[PDB]
Write an enzyme that holds these catalytic residues in place. Structure first.
Site, PDB file in Angstrom:
ATOM      1  N   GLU A 287      50.626  43.368  56.270  1.00 55.71           N
ATOM      2  CA  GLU A 287      50.587  43.004  57.404  1.00 55.71           C
ATOM      3  C   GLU A 287      48.889  43.029  58.037  1.00 55.71           C
ATOM      4  O   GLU A 287      48.173  43.942  57.338  1.00 55.71           O
ATOM      5  CB  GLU A 287      51.173  43.899  58.390  1.00 55.71           C
ATOM      6  CG  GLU A 287      52.761  43.958  58.169  1.00 55.71           C
ATOM      7  CD  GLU A 287      53.412  45.101  58.851  1.00 55.71           C
ATOM      8  OE1 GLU A 287      52.707  45.824  59.562  1.00 55.71           O
ATOM      9  OE2 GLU A 287      54.407  45.541  58.497  1.00 55.71           O
TER      10      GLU A 287
ATOM     11  N   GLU B 154      57.146  50.711  56.828  1.00 53.52           N
ATOM     12  CA  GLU B 154      56.146  51.982  57.160  1.00 53.52           C
ATOM     13  C   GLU B 154      56.740  53.420  57.065  1.00 53.52           C
ATOM     14  O   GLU B 154      56.977  53.984  58.371  1.00 53.52           O
ATOM     15  CB  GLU B 154      55.608  51.714  58.526  1.00 53.52           C
ATOM     16  CG  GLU B 154      54.504  50.439  58.421  1.00 53.52           C
ATOM     17  CD  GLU B 154      53.731  50.268  59.710  1.00 53.52           C
ATOM     18  OE1 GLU B 154      54.204  50.710  60.640  1.00 53.52           O
ATOM     19  OE2 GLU B 154      52.494  49.771  59.617  1.00 53.52           O
TER      20      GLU B 154
END
Lengths: 683, 687
Positions: free
Chosen positions: B318, B159
């Site tokens: 995720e 991320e």
């Protein structure tokens, strides 16, 4: 000590008229656009614009190089069209080259963090380096434009202290130390003033005075020091303005100078009454509060401006046609506001009406701020209104309104910048109470009862009025306290509220029962306060009064009243609160005069409802009138300005000849005025 | 331009199955637990895990010293059990030895304050020395794992910009200077773009460009500069990712690379559509929004992912089985969410379903974040659902779902990361309005009318759709404006709302009446705005419309409409407000197309109620349907085979008609062409 009043004069071949226009920034637009500005200005009845306010980087594009041509052309284009120029010093905010070369000009916040360029006014009020650069630009602007036939005034800098009121840099620290030495003379005087025996804050000499820097969130600064830092910050900016003004004046004698204030009900960046002595004509920036307070607070601010100017004609430098850019939600102004708000400012004594700004910007931080020519262009309701207003100001000019003054009210509502500052301390009885909201509430409640008050600064002549109000005037010196006793003893009628006269000018408490310096005048004695709110489960959130009104936020625990007093209202409460039957509003006689003490916050609504009873006890039952309109008068000839204060059309009697009207119709001595409407009459 | 799509391939070159698993962190647990993990992964039908993501301090415990053996053994154990490995670069967050030795890697906030270790991702995106360290680890990781038979993809870093999107250090200053030069070529062009004639901000050269550092609370940054700093910040991280990706690829050519995005309705850390061009397969992290928006926004975000991937199969890297750790109140998910939310992601085109994380941590900052194996262990409803979902993905794999694509909707709801960035400026007409809420509102309102929209990035092909929506698309460049104009003239049906097309790409206002670049298309002209709210006593907090809906937050003051237009609704208000009888919803005919302009915020409920009349004006009354369910279809090329996924959107069981053979069902059942679906339930059919 006050400067002689001096008002911007007409261009050659022109006559004396109400000034109309606004901020103009030709340097933000391709030069091609300027001819269109001139066409639209003529159409709107614009006759004055303020130019160059943030033009430093264009006028001095690199250090020691000056470029005046573009500005000479702009000024000539305006002038030959009959439009006068209020010329800025251009010193409001420095260029990138300046700050890159001299980071020491940037102000530092409480934590000592540098405030960077990126917005505006990022400079230390006490920086000798910034002063040097500013005075240099002042000198060169004045030398270049001293022969110009189209310049009628100086707009010095812009809104001192709007962003840089506070600086915590070492320049500020040293300047504050010197300011304290001037004020107090000895370090022991400072120690006593600030009560430094408490918390081991005793200072041995002036080097041990530090500014109110970061002390950790939630911790409590010395309140005397904090209050004095506000006084000091206002004086520091004032001394810089004086220096710039004096440089300009040395080179262009006979051109009147001003700088734009930020006077609004809740604005207290500077002591503007103090600053008012240092300008040739007083000028203001005011932007409407959206919602229910819109009209009244426009009227209130303009009245305070008329108080600051000591009833001399004053200058509305800025307001907005509609939405601003800077609020969390920028509500638009109600249709009619352009003419209405502006004529309210005229009614309250303005002989100049100007907006920020002439053409709505298409780029930059203020592009969403409304203007005279909107993004939409000349085919807009706002521009049509702008044109209507210019024609109206022309008609009022033909009628000879210039130089007339707003009549003296029977009532003065006192405003005190320093008391506001004292109320901002974070360990007061409640942080919900500021001085400033109370005089507004009184102005509005009096208006609900058909009375137009003058808002009068505390150092000015409120004690020459038949009636006055001290609304949360937290500080009272012995000198002001004496003015209060004599005002009443000599026959004055005086309203006094909670949070009045708690302390002297050093924020030392007057002991023995509040209000400790005038309790024998008002005939009440308060032992304790009972703050109220909604932040604690089961804590007191309001107190009903027995006269059908309701107190919020604050109530005095009055435990005795004078034998000469009359209780007009008392609280009703559950017995265990201790507040049941405690006096809430108390009338008194003292010498030849009368007082009413209001021991709680009743707001516009509770004050308005309580006023007949309170006025009655003072022998003023005949004063009340029609609250649906505000009636404001100017006279040398009488001109009456009549504004609907409500959300429905209202019909009222009007005397005289109607000379201006917006959203209203006059027929046979009666005006039907729509919401946001206004009529102006002469006789 | 775009990288060729390359999907992670199965172990032993066998059948490409739907991938299922999650983040796996054996370095957090004693080795005996690893054998327990394998047992439980097999039971759950896990076939892929992502390992090593924050393992820098374990893999390079001191500068230039490597400890691979634990990871070698973990990967071997996984692969021998039939479980594939998505291998991280491990470059997501640096060890203490690195930051202690090089404090200059730590990012600085707007005030110049250093952001210390103690959490994660505390590094400047444009630090040259951090880049050196990251590239070195990439190289050592790739060289060591090259040819491993169980490693199927690279998970580059983690991320980007979750915590370090913004840096204000001198590295960022220098990089932003170079970025501005690349974009604008000359300082004159920078000055013009940022409108620097205002407030004496004119710059003489590129050294006079500084980042939008601290200017005091409540003050107003140059909005052009602020908007470009978000562009720059996205690009700066993208350049680092490209560098890490390129090193890895140069050593293990052919092994597919991704990095995990943060695409959700309200997420805009980076221009994810731009970044989508740089990965072999697009992957996302999405976490449910608690409360009434839960299901719809899961669907929305996954739809947007399918938009970013240009309908290529994409990877759900995720999500959470239940509560997260990071909200002020971490509501648990409704029972059924494990299967249901995952199958919504599959329906919207995902060929991989993964969770953060496999086993709930017993220590550290995310120990309260739910996982596939809860603190409670295998005897838990969550682990049972996890096993059910694995079995379901096996069944869908048996039916050949992999490689099908989410069918093209009749409606494109347009999303623009840059428009969102522009609406974030603090001196706009109202700070209550963000671009992002509007496309979500329209997606849900369309769903309430039985229509499943595609969420389509503005640079993608929304102008190839039957119907499109510009929902608060604040920025319209000249190019995009032309596309709008052509779209409608050629027969497109276009919805446009308030806060659309106010400015061009540098936030310069289109003049002459809003929306200044397309007002002739929609046939309305707006002179000013009437924002609304509850923060100022007596100001407007709402405006009723004459079609029985209510506007909040914002209304356009429409002052004229075109000869070809039809007012569908207008405001009702007290006269003093000036808004009474002002048009609120206006239909127009333009060329062979139709528009509807919605000049106020009507929300999901008001839009849903207004849609039938609006669609009607476009000539589309037959597009209606049952909004109690969301129906999402996937299909092969030739459109030979179809899969339908049906989701209950309500709080009571529903029964609907369905075609085909049921192949999966959760909290639901199918019998003779009728699907009974409980709340939080789903069925999947094959036609």
């Amino acid at each position: 000590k006050r400067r002689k009043h001096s008002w911007p004069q007409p261009l050659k071949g022109a006559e004396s008229r109400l000034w109309y226009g606004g901020d103009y920034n030709p340097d933000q637009w391709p030069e091609e656009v300027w001819d269109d500005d001139i066409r639209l200005m003529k159409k709107a009845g614009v006759n004055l614009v303020s130019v160059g306010i943030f033009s430093w980087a264009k006028i001095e594009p690199e250090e020691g190089k000056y470029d005046f041509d573009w500005l000479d052309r702009a000024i000539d284009k305006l002038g030959k069209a009959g439009i006068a120029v209020d010329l800025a010093s251009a010193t409001a905010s420095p260029p990138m080259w300046l700050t890159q070369a001299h980071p020491e000009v940037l102000w530092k916040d409480e934590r000592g963090d540098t405030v960077w360029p990126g917005a505006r006014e990022h400079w230390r009020p006490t920086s000798p380096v910034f002063r040097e650069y500013a005075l240099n630009l002042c000198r060169r602007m004045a030398e270049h434009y001293k022969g110009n036939p189209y310049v009628v005034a100086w707009h010095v800098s812009n809104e001192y202290g709007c962003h840089n009121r506070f600086d915590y840099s070492d320049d500020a620290m040293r300047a504050f130390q010197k300011w304290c030495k001037k004020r107090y003379k000895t370090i022991d005087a400072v120690n006593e003033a600030w009560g430094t025996a408490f918390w081991a804050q005793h200072m041995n000499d002036f080097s041990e005075i530090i500014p109110p820097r970061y002390i950790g969130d939630g911790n409590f600064m010395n309140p005397g020091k904090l209050l004095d830092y506000k006084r000091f910050s206002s004086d520091a900016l004032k001394e810089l303005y004086i220096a710039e003004r004096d440089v300009l004046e040395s080179i262009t004698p006979g051109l009147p100078l001003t700088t734009n204030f930020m006077v609004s009900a809740g604005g207290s960046m500077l002591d503007y009454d103090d600053w008012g002595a240092e300008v040739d004509f007083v000028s203001n920036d005011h932007y409407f509060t959206p919602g229910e307070a819109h009209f009244d607070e426009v009227a209130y601010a303009a009245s305070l401006m008329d108080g600051i100017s000591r009833k001399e004609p004053w200058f509305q430098m800025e307001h907005s046609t509609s939405a601003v850019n800077w609020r969390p939600i920028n509500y638009r102004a109600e249709p009619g506001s352009v003419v209405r708000d502006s004529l309210a400012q005229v009614a309250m004594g303005a002989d100049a009406i100007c907006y920020f700004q002439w053409r709505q910007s298409k780029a930059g931080a203020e592009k969403w701020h409304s203007s005279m020519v909107p993004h939409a262009g000349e085919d807009s309701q706002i521009f049509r209104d702008v044109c209507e207003l210019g024609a109206d100001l022309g008609r009022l000019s033909d009628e000879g309104l210039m130089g007339t003054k707003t009549v003296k009210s029977k009532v003065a509502v006192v405003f005190d910048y320093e008391s506001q500052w004292a109320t901002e301390y974070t360990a007061n009885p409640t942080q919900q109470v500021d001085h400033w909201t109370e005089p507004l509430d009184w102005f509005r409640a009096l208006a609900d009862n058909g009375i137009t008050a003058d808002v009068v600064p505390v150092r000015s002549d409120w004690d020459s009025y038949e009636i006055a109000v001290l609304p949360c005037v937290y500080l009272l010196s012995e000198e002001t306290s004496r003015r209060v006793r004599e005002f009443v003893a000599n026959g004055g009628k005086l309203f006094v509220t909670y949070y009045t006269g708690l302390s002297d000018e050093n924020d030392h408490i007057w002991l023995g029962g509040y209000p400790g310096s005038i309790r024998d005048v008002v005939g009440v004695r308060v032992e304790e306060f009972a703050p109220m709110g909604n932040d604690m489960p089961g804590a007191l959130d309001h107190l009903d009064l027995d006269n059908g009104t309701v107190a919020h936020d604050f109530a005095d625990v009055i435990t005795s009243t004078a034998d000469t007093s009359t209780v007009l209202a008392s609280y009703k409460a559950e017995r265990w609160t201790g507040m049941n039957e405690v006096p809430a509003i108390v009338a008194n006689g003292y010498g030849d005069g009368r007082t009413v003490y209001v021991g709680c916050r009743l707001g516009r609504q509770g004050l308005a409802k309580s006023l007949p009873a309170m006025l009655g006890s003072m022998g003023l039952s005949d004063l009340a009138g029609d609250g649906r309109v505000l009636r404001v008068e100017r006279a040398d000839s009488h001109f009456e300005f009549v504004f609907n204060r409500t959300h429905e059309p209202v019909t009222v009697d009007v005397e005289g000849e109607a000379i201006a009207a917006s959203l209203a119709h006059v027929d046979d001595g009666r005006a039907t005025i729509d919401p946001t409407g206004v009529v102006v009459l002469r006789r």
